[model samples]
Target: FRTFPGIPKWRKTHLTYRIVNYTPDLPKDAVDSAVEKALKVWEEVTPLTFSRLYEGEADIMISFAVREHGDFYPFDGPGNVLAHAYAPGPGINGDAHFDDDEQWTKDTTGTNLFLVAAHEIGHSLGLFHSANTEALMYPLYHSLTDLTRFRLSQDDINGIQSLYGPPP
Candidate 1:
C-alpha cells in the first residue's frame, strides 16, 4: 500500500522538520546527524526539499518514546516495533515516533537510527511499507552498514518519484 487513496500530500515542494528530542542511546549530535542524513536520502531523489526547525511545529516532528507515549498507538516494547510515523497531513500528521525501549545505535550493532528514520520518513512522506524486501520502505528492518555506498532501491525510488516526481 502506498498513498491513502484521496489523502493529499504536502502542498508545497519545500518542507520543514523538527527533532523534538534525542534518543538516550546515542549522542544528541549523532541523532541529529542521522535524522538529517535520513531526510537527505529522499531529497536526493525528489524535488521536495527539507529544512530543520529548532523550535515550534514543523511538517515532520520527530521524537522518542516508550510504551504509549501521547498517541493512540502504543509501542510493543523492543524487537517488535523500532519506530513509526504518521501520513502527511496537519497537526500530528507526518510526526515520527521512535521506541526508546530499543537500543538505537549508529552502526549495525543495534537498531540503526538512520535506517529506521529513513523508513519512517517514507511514511511521513506518504509512502507505505513496500512488499519488495530490497526497498528502503520494506516493513522489516535490517542491519545496514556501508552508509557511504547506501542508495535507495529502484522500487523505493520509483514509488517516491510517483508521489513527488523526479529530482530537478
Candidate 2:
C-alpha cells in the first residue's frame, strides 16, 4: 500500500529512471518504449518529469526477474503477483520488479507490460491501490488494449494530485 500515510511523495518534480534489464518476452526496444510510455502516464498528470539513465544510479531502477530475485518479497511463478514496486525513498525505493516468468506483451493477448508498469510506477510515486476498479492504481491487473484511448480514473487523478498537486 502506502509508505505510511501523510502522503509520502518525491520531493523533486524531476526524477531519473533506469531499466536495469529487459524481458525476453519482448524486444529490448519495446521494453524500453513501454517503460517510457508508462512513466509518461504519470508525468502527464503531474508536474513530475522523468529522465532515463544509461549508467550509474537513478531515482527509479526497473528490472525483470523470476522467483527469489534478491528481494524480500520473491515473486511467484506466473499468475499470483505479476509485479511490484517500492514507494519513494532511497536505495531500493522506487525500484520495480516484474515476474519474468509471465508472458509479458504489448497488448491484451498477454500481460501488458505498459499496464503493469503504469500500476507499479503508481506505487513508486507513493500511491496505494485504489478500491475503485477503474483506477489505474487498482491492485488487480485488468487487460487494457487501447493505450491511445486510456485515461486515468478520477480517483487516480485525485489521489496523485493530492500528493504532487495538479499538472503544471
Candidate 3:
C-alpha cells in the first residue's frame, strides 16, 4: 500500500550518505540542497548526525534513477511513487532513486525536491510512510502547505527516538 512511515535502521553514530548520479529536470545545486534539508530534519531532532561521502565510497551512497533501474522495486513514474530508497545495509541499501518521469521543482508547483527527498531520506535512514496525515512521512503530496513547518508528530518523535534516543 506504500503508506507506512519509514523505520530506518538503528545506528549509534552519524549516518553517512553520498550522491551517485545527477538529474536533468533540476540543477545540481537544487538536488544537493534538497537532500541536505532532508537530512537536517533528523539531525535537529535527535542525536543523529549526517555526513556526505564521495561517490562509490559512502556508507550510504545516494543516487538518481528512473523506471526499471534493476532493483526488484521499479519506479512507477510521475504521480505515484516519485522516489524510493533502501534500508541501511550494503549494496542497494541506503541508496535513493528518483523518478525522472515526474516534473520535480524547487517551488510550489510540481513535486518539491525537499519534500520528496525528505521522505526518501526517511526510508534511507529506515522509515516508511506514516498513516497520520500531519506527518511529513505521509504518503501523499500536499504542496499547498509548508513541509519545513511539518515537524515530527508525537508518534513520529517517539518512534525515531526509540531507535536513536534523545539528542546529545
Candidate 4:
C-alpha cells in the first residue's frame, strides 16, 4: 500500500469510470463483472465510490490494447505486462490499459482479470506497490486461483486508509 512520490490524487471520493474498449476473448458481461468487482475491491476499503459511465468522458478510461499500440510498451507475445494504469489526474492520467492478447480470463486461468484489474486500479488511485509479499499492491505477480474469501492485507488496508481515510 505504498504511495508514489509526487503522485496526483483525486479531489472527490465519487469517481466515474468507462470501459471504452474491450477484448473479444471474454464475454461482454464477463468483462463488465471483472471491472465491477475490481473497483469493488477498493470501494470496500476506502471511503470512495466508483460509478460506471456508459457515455461521455469519465474520470477513468479503461481499454484493451495489442502489441505496439500507441505507447512504447509493446506487449509482444506472452505474459510480459498484463496491464498498466496511470495515477489520478485529468485526460490520460487515470486510465488503465490491458493487453488484448494476454491470458485474461473470467474464471481461474493464466491471469485473473479481477486480480490484475484490482491491482491496476490501485495505481489509478495513486497507490504504489508494497514491499510486503502478501500485499495486493505487491510488485511481483503470483497466480493464486483462490479468491473465495479474499481480503487485502494490513499493508493494503493501512495504505489506502492513509489516502482516503477509514471505511464507512
Question: 1-168, model 4: which lDDT tens digit per residue?
Answer: 578887568889999999998788888898999999999988998999989998999998999988887875666656867888988899888899998878778767557888889889989998898888888888773453257767877888898888898878
TM-score of each: 0.94, 0.93, 0.85, 0.93
Best by TM-score: 1
The per-model lDDT (C-alpha) reads 0.87, 0.86, 0.72, 0.85
Per-residue lDDT for 1-168 in model 3, tens only?
A: 132245446455677778788888899999899889878877777888888877557766766677788889888866777888777666778778888888878876787887788777776766666677766666664543475466656655665666677798
Q: Which candidate is the best by lDDT?
A: 1
Q: Give the TM-score of candidate 1.
A: 0.94
Which candidate, 2 or 3, has the higher lDDT?
Answer: 2
Please, what are the lDDT tens digits per residue for candidate 1 over residues 1-168?
Answer: 456567567778999999998777999989999999999999999999999898999999999999989899999997888898998899999999999999998887888899899989999999887788778887774643355577889888888988999999
Q: Which regions in candidate 2 have their CA more than 4 angstroms from the true location?
A: 1-6, 141-148
Question: In lDDT terms, how accurate is model 3?
Answer: 0.72
- Scored by Cα lDDT, where does model 1 land? 0.87
Model 2 C-alpha lDDT per residue in residues 56-106, reported as the tens digit of each score: 999999999999999899988978789989989888988999999899988
Ranking by lDDT: 1, 2, 4, 3
Q: Compared to the true structure, candidate 3 yields what TM-score? A: 0.85
* Pairs that collide, model 2: none
Name the 10 consecutive residues with the lowest summed lDDT in model 1: 140-149
